[PDB]
Amino acid sequence: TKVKYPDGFRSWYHVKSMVIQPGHPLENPFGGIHHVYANAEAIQGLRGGNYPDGAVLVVDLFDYQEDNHALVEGKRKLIGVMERDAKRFSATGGWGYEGFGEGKPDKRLVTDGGQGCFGCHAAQKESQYVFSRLRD
Amino acid sequence: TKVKYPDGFRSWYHVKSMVIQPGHPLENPFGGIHHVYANAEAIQGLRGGNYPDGAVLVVDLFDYQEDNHALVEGKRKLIGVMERDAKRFSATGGWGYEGFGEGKPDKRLVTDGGQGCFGCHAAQKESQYVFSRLRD
Numbered sequence: 001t002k003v004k005y006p007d008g009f010r011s012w013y014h015v016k017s018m019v020i021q022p023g024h025p026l027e028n029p030f031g032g033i034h035h036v037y038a039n040a041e042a043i044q045g046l047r048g049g050n051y052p053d054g055a056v057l058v059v060d061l062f063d064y065q066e067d068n069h070a071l072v073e074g075k076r077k078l079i080g081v082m083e084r085d086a087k088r089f090s091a092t093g094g095w096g097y098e099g100f101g102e103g104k105p106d107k108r109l110v111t112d113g114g115q116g117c118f119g120c121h122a123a124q125k126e127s128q129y130v131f132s133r134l135r136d
Numbered sequence: 137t138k139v140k141y142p143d144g145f146r147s148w149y150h151v152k153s154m155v156i157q158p159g160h161p162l163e164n165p166f167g168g169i170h171h172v173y174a175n176a177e178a179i180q181g182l183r184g185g186n187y188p189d190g191a192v193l194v195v196d197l198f199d200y201q202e203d204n205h206a207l208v209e210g211k212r213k214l215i216g217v218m219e220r221d222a223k224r225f226s227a228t229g230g231w232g233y234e235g236f237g238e239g240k241p242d243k244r245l246v247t248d249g250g251q252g253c254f255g256c257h258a259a260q261k262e263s264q265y266v267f268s269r270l271r272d
């Protein structure tokens with residue numbers, strides 16, 4: 001019941017992006033420029049199907065520097081990971097929730113079996129616990 | 137001697153992003169959240185390899201809205217497209233330059249054969265007229 005490191009996620013489908021600036025309620029620790037990625041499996045859910053076991057969503061969080069009215073991507077802060085397994089991740093609505101510090105497999109961030117992550121993602125039960133909307 | 141609309145570019149490898157805000161010298165018309173994408177042939181070039189004919193880079197430019205210490209993606213403004221053909225686009229350094237308003241295939245923007253585009257990109261001769269760098 002550990003979430004696997006999503007090897008190769010940077011080659012996945014880019015779902016969407018958002019900037020969370022200082023002062024945002026989620027600034028600790030979501031502050032930065034973030035990009036949402038989906039594997040083949042997760043695309044099926046985003047398109048309006050059921051999320052199949054093996055679907056993985058990644059949220060890739062970068063620091064940024066405001067440089068003359070450009071926001072410029074700096075170092076990666078972390079990745080958040082949601083891993084669909086209806087049986088193994090049953091306690092958290094069938095998604096496994098993990099963080100990797102600087103996107104490194106060695107730096108697991110989740111210490112409460114993902115109940116905190118699940119606490120907020122539960123509001124989205126009707127879209128299978130997923131906030132991001134697939135956009136053209 | 138026309139740049140092909142890059143059908144399916146939303147499914148390609150996401151290279152990088154940047155935000156250009158009010159007050160940036162490039163605000164008009166490059167203002168917004170932009171995402172750079174690369175087809176397989178473009179990735180060869182970006183990796184430090186050479187760009188094969190048929191390499192395509194896309195810059196996808198979104199309007200954004202302020203939303204309580206968040207910049208949220210709004211409407212697509214346009215896409216910019218560079219298509220590799222050393223022979224057919226030799227007047228603009230082996231890349232064909234085109235813009236599509238709102239990313240629509242029917243709203244081609246470039247009127248000067250891409251000389252305007254090439255004029256700025258020519259700064260980057262030493263990285264084959266590409267600004268963007270592959271990051272992890």
Ligand code: HEC
Pocket residue numbers: 016017018026034036057058059080081082097098099110114116117118120121129130131132133
């Ligand atoms: C609310 C107080 C949140 C808590 C706690 C967590 N997440 Fe979340 N998450 C939240 C929002 C509003 C979004 C959407 C961002 C966007 O650009 O629209 C997200 C997104 C994710 C994603 C991308 C998939 C999706 O649901 O859109 C992942 C992979 C994700 N979050 C993981 C994650 C983990 C591992 C958490 C605990 C450490 C976690 N989130 C907490 C809101 C909230």
Ligand code: HEC
Pocket residue numbers: 152153154170172193194195216217218233234235246250252253254256257265266267268269
């Ligand atoms: C300088 C005044 C520019 C002019 C005029 C044009 N472009 Fe450009 N382009 C510019 C920069 C600084 C960047 C990098 C942005 C980043 O996030 O790093 C770009 C990028 C592109 C891309 C992505 C590929 C790359 O070189 O990084 C494409 C596909 C692209 N630009 C196309 C484009 C076209 C079609 C133009 C004429 C309409 C054009 N550019 C003008 C700077 C400048």
Ligand SMILES: [Zn+2]
Pocket residue numbers: 023205
């Ligand atoms: Zn405020």
Ligand SMILES: [Zn+2]
Pocket residue numbers: 066068069070157158159
């Ligand atoms: Zn500014």
